[PDB]
Design an enzyme around this catalytic site. Structure first.
Site, PDB file in Angstrom:
ATOM      1  N   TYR A  71      29.271  38.415  40.059  1.00 20.01           N
ATOM      2  CA  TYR A  71      28.194  38.836  40.894  1.00 20.01           C
ATOM      3  C   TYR A  71      26.953  38.785  40.081  1.00 20.01           C
ATOM      4  O   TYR A  71      26.626  39.387  39.168  1.00 20.01           O
ATOM      5  CB  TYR A  71      28.364  39.792  41.689  1.00 20.01           C
ATOM      6  CG  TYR A  71      29.672  39.728  42.833  1.00 20.01           C
ATOM      7  CD1 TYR A  71      29.532  39.151  43.832  1.00 20.01           C
ATOM      8  CD2 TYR A  71      30.822  40.433  42.360  1.00 20.01           C
ATOM      9  CE1 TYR A  71      30.413  38.876  44.601  1.00 20.01           C
ATOM     10  CE2 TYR A  71      31.962  40.030  43.187  1.00 20.01           C
ATOM     11  CZ  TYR A  71      31.670  39.197  44.435  1.00 20.01           C
ATOM     12  OH  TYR A  71      32.770  38.903  45.087  1.00 20.01           O
ATOM     13  N   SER A  72      25.758  37.999  40.530  1.00 21.72           N
ATOM     14  CA  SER A  72      24.520  37.928  39.683  1.00 21.72           C
ATOM     15  C   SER A  72      24.063  39.478  40.208  1.00 21.72           C
ATOM     16  O   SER A  72      23.982  39.884  41.211  1.00 21.72           O
ATOM     17  CB  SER A  72      23.564  36.952  40.355  1.00 21.72           C
ATOM     18  OG  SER A  72      24.200  35.728  40.341  1.00 21.72           O
ATOM     19  N   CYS A 253      19.988  28.717  40.944  1.00 21.07           N
ATOM     20  CA  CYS A 253      20.979  29.613  41.441  1.00 21.07           C
ATOM     21  C   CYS A 253      21.605  29.630  42.680  1.00 21.07           C
ATOM     22  O   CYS A 253      20.731  29.181  43.796  1.00 21.07           O
ATOM     23  CB  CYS A 253      20.726  30.958  40.893  1.00 21.07           C
ATOM     24  SG  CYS A 253      21.906  32.197  40.702  1.00 21.07           S
ATOM     25  N   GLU A 293      22.815  28.389  37.134  1.00 20.66           N
ATOM     26  CA  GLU A 293      24.046  29.230  37.477  1.00 20.66           C
ATOM     27  C   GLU A 293      24.526  28.786  38.698  1.00 20.66           C
ATOM     28  O   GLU A 293      23.700  29.458  39.762  1.00 20.66           O
ATOM     29  CB  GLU A 293      23.644  30.744  37.150  1.00 20.66           C
ATOM     30  CG  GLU A 293      24.808  31.592  37.725  1.00 20.66           C
ATOM     31  CD  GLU A 293      24.324  32.950  37.695  1.00 20.66           C
ATOM     32  OE1 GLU A 293      23.703  33.612  36.671  1.00 20.66           O
ATOM     33  OE2 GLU A 293      24.729  33.578  38.694  1.00 20.66           O
ATOM     34  N   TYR A 295      27.659  28.292  41.662  1.00 17.18           N
ATOM     35  CA  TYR A 295      29.219  28.645  41.944  1.00 17.18           C
ATOM     36  C   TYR A 295      29.575  28.133  43.048  1.00 17.18           C
ATOM     37  O   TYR A 295      30.753  28.705  43.413  1.00 17.18           O
ATOM     38  CB  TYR A 295      29.288  30.262  41.735  1.00 17.18           C
ATOM     39  CG  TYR A 295      28.169  30.938  42.212  1.00 17.18           C
ATOM     40  CD1 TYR A 295      28.468  31.332  43.550  1.00 17.18           C
ATOM     41  CD2 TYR A 295      26.999  31.364  41.725  1.00 17.18           C
ATOM     42  CE1 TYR A 295      27.376  31.968  44.291  1.00 17.18           C
ATOM     43  CE2 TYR A 295      26.106  32.057  42.332  1.00 17.18           C
ATOM     44  CZ  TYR A 295      26.082  32.287  43.728  1.00 17.18           C
ATOM     45  OH  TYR A 295      25.092  32.965  44.370  1.00 17.18           O
TER      46      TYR A 295
HETATM   47  C1  LIG Z   1      28.106  33.410  37.613  1.00 13.97           C
HETATM   48  C2  LIG Z   1      28.088  33.948  39.098  1.00 13.97           C
HETATM   49  C3  LIG Z   1      27.519  34.457  39.762  1.00 13.97           C
HETATM   50  C4  LIG Z   1      27.873  34.999  41.355  1.00 13.97           C
HETATM   51  N1  LIG Z   1      27.086  35.733  42.007  1.00 13.97           N
HETATM   52  C5  LIG Z   1      27.213  35.775  42.998  1.00 13.97           C
HETATM   53  C6  LIG Z   1      26.199  36.871  43.837  1.00 13.97           C
HETATM   54  O1  LIG Z   1      25.015  37.140  43.375  1.00 13.97           O
HETATM   55  N2  LIG Z   1      26.349  36.888  45.137  1.00 13.97           N
HETATM   56  C7  LIG Z   1      27.706  36.612  45.781  1.00 13.97           C
HETATM   57  O2  LIG Z   1      27.957  36.844  47.165  1.00 13.97           O
HETATM   58  N3  LIG Z   1      28.603  35.575  45.107  1.00 13.97           N
HETATM   59  C8  LIG Z   1      28.441  35.391  43.663  1.00 13.97           C
HETATM   60  N4  LIG Z   1      29.186  34.691  43.029  1.00 13.97           N
HETATM   61  C9  LIG Z   1      30.771  34.222  43.594  1.00 13.97           C
HETATM   62  C10 LIG Z   1      31.534  35.519  43.496  1.00 13.97           C
HETATM   63  O3  LIG Z   1      31.825  35.549  42.145  1.00 13.97           O
HETATM   64  C11 LIG Z   1      33.059  35.102  44.148  1.00 13.97           C
HETATM   65  O4  LIG Z   1      33.353  33.914  43.834  1.00 13.97           O
HETATM   66  C12 LIG Z   1      32.769  35.380  45.833  1.00 13.97           C
HETATM   67  O5  LIG Z   1      32.138  36.561  46.160  1.00 13.97           O
HETATM   68  C13 LIG Z   1      34.113  35.181  46.421  1.00 13.97           C
HETATM   69  O6  LIG Z   1      34.956  36.224  45.927  1.00 13.97           O
HETATM   70  P1  LIG Z   1      36.024  36.902  46.919  1.00 13.97           P
HETATM   71  O7  LIG Z   1      36.896  37.356  46.134  1.00 13.97           O
HETATM   72  O8  LIG Z   1      35.299  37.180  48.085  1.00 13.97           O
HETATM   73  O9  LIG Z   1      37.014  35.512  47.488  1.00 13.97           O
HETATM   74  P2  LIG Z   1      38.417  34.740  47.116  1.00 13.97           P
HETATM   75  O10 LIG Z   1      39.197  35.680  47.712  1.00 13.97           O
HETATM   76  O11 LIG Z   1      38.956  34.508  45.568  1.00 13.97           O
HETATM   77  O12 LIG Z   1      38.293  33.519  47.631  1.00 13.97           O
HETATM   78  C14 LIG Z   1      37.890  32.400  47.007  1.00 13.97           C
HETATM   79  C15 LIG Z   1      38.807  31.337  46.947  1.00 13.97           C
HETATM   80  O13 LIG Z   1      39.195  30.767  48.202  1.00 13.97           O
HETATM   81  C16 LIG Z   1      38.915  29.354  48.314  1.00 13.97           C
HETATM   82  N5  LIG Z   1      37.550  29.120  49.059  1.00 13.97           N
HETATM   83  C17 LIG Z   1      36.313  29.661  49.142  1.00 13.97           C
HETATM   84  N6  LIG Z   1      35.575  29.331  50.136  1.00 13.97           N
HETATM   85  C18 LIG Z   1      36.273  28.265  50.658  1.00 13.97           C
HETATM   86  C19 LIG Z   1      35.831  27.343  52.009  1.00 13.97           C
HETATM   87  N7  LIG Z   1      34.816  26.993  52.539  1.00 13.97           N
HETATM   88  N8  LIG Z   1      36.872  26.326  52.197  1.00 13.97           N
HETATM   89  C20 LIG Z   1      38.151  26.529  51.736  1.00 13.97           C
HETATM   90  N9  LIG Z   1      38.776  27.182  50.574  1.00 13.97           N
HETATM   91  C21 LIG Z   1      37.499  28.126  50.304  1.00 13.97           C
HETATM   92  C22 LIG Z   1      38.941  28.978  46.752  1.00 13.97           C
HETATM   93  O14 LIG Z   1      40.263  28.828  46.452  1.00 13.97           O
HETATM   94  C23 LIG Z   1      38.151  30.036  46.053  1.00 13.97           C
HETATM   95  O15 LIG Z   1      38.875  30.211  44.742  1.00 13.97           O
HETATM   96  C24 LIG Z   1      29.084  34.375  41.846  1.00 13.97           C
HETATM   97  C25 LIG Z   1      29.907  33.593  40.876  1.00 13.97           C
HETATM   98  C26 LIG Z   1      29.715  33.491  39.676  1.00 13.97           C
HETATM   99  C27 LIG Z   1      30.625  32.448  38.891  1.00 13.97           C
END
Ligand SMILES: Cc1cc2nc3c(=O)[nH]c(=O)nc-3n(C[C@H](O)[C@H](O)[C@H](O)COP(=O)(O)OP(=O)(O)OC[C@H]3O[C@@H](n4cnc5c(N)ncnc54)[C@H](O)[C@@H]3O)c2cc1C
Length: 295
Positions: A71-72, A253, A293, A295
């Site tokens: 998370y950023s 971003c 950046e 994602y």
């Molecule tokens: C460098 C970086 C910075 C980030 N900064 C932030 C930030 O500041 N704030 C923020 O909220 N997030 C940020 N993110 C994204 C964050 O890391 C997580 O990916 C995001 O919060 C979702 O994680 P989760 O555990 O909630 O989801 P998971 O439970 O892992 O669900 C995600 C998975 O489900 C699937 N999926 C997701 N969306 C969809 C869709 N529309 N349709 C179908 N399948 C889908 C994919 O397989 C994905 O891998 C950042 C990512 C990176 C890489």
């Protein structure tokens, strides 16, 4: 000099949630929370533009421990209270369509975070990243192109640049350059940190320009919904002129899907002066002045 991996996944820092507040106002789409964590007891230090990892509890569908999600960082190095004791995140609750087994699906780490209660302990790793660092030069120009949660690193830059308390805490960084934020969200209630962003523009009209791209409330010249790429196209010549300055830095971003339109707009602008944007951009990346950046 830049702090990196002070805490790793195998031995994360255990922080405590101080607050969890909503950023999407009534009438908005989705849930995005501003979460502040207590860093006292540990030595996790960080700078603007970096990220941290959060390890949510539970196991995945295969019974394997959940891994960290990045998370950023949304706060300056000093934290929202300018006391060097906390760190904040800007987290959107992930939820989507049916074609993924079931009805509405909820992201594991984001749901955990958006519903987390103050006092709860959280596993934090990092900080990580050297891709979105702000220049130390107080006279540099900074272009910020963000959508949704992509506003996070921009908040760290803008707070450091314009918050009274930050300016008093950073004697060596009295920003006097020009910063331009082009922020895209679906509705006005979805404008994250709206009140504070506009407060900054009102106080620093010559050092900060705020441009919105609100899809459900504005239409581009073609009649389609307004997106950040449309605003960049709208001010393509201006942005290109600013980018030509040796001290200008650009930051992009947010969720992927924004870069293509941005490049198309700048390419057309640069081409008028016999410059191939894709090549100029490669040099900017090499020089560390084009930061991305997504994602
Ligand atoms: C460098 C970086 C910075 C980030 N900064 C932030 C930030 O500041 N704030 C923020 O909220 N997030 C940020 N993110 C994204 C964050 O890391 C997580 O990916 C995001 O919060 C979702 O994680 P989760 O555990 O909630 O989801 P998971 O439970 O892992 O669900 C995600 C998975 O489900 C699937 N999926 C997701 N969306 C969809 C869709 N529309 N349709 C179908 N399948 C889908 C994919 O397989 C994905 O891998 C950042 C990512 C990176 C890489």
């Amino acid at each position: 000099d830049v702090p990196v991996n002070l805490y790793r996944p195998n031995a994360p820092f255990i922080g405590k949630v101080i607050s969890n507040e909503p950023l999407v106002k009534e009438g908005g789409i989705g849930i995005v929370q501003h979460i502040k964590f207590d860093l006292t007891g540990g030595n996790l230090k960080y700078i603007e533009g970096q990220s941290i990892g959060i390890i949510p509890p539970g196991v995945d569908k295969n019974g394997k421990p959940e891994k960290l999600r990045l998370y950023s960082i949304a706060s300056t190095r000093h934290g929202d209270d300018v006391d060097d004791k906390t760190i904040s995140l800007c987290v959107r609750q992930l939820e989507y369509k049916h074609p993924e087994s079931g009805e509405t699906v909820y992201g594991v780490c984001s749901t955990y975070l958006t519903h987390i209660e103050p006092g709860s302990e959280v596993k934090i790793t990092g900080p990580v990243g050297k891709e979105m660092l702000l220049p130390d030069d107080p006279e540099a120009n900074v272009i910020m192109l963000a959508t949704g949660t992509g506003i996070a690193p921009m908040r760290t830059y803008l707070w450091r640049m314009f918050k009274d308390a930050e300016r008093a805490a950073n004697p060596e960084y009295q920003f006097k350059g020009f910063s331009w934020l082009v922020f895209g969200v679906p509705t006005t209630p979805n404008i994250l940190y709206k009140e504070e962003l506009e407060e900054i523009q009102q106080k620093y009209p010559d050092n900060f320009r705020l441009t919105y791209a609100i899809s459900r409330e504005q239409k581009n010249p073609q009649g389609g919904r307004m997106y950040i790429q449309d605003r960049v196209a709208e001010h393509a010549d201006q942005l290109w002129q600013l980018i030509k300055n040796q001290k200008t830095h650009t930051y992009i971003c947010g969720p992927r899907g924004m870069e293509e339109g941005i490049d198309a707009a700048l390419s057309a602008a640069a081409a008028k002066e016999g410059v191939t944007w894709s090549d100029y951009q490669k040099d900017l990346k090499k020089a560390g002045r084009w930061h991305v950046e997504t994602y």
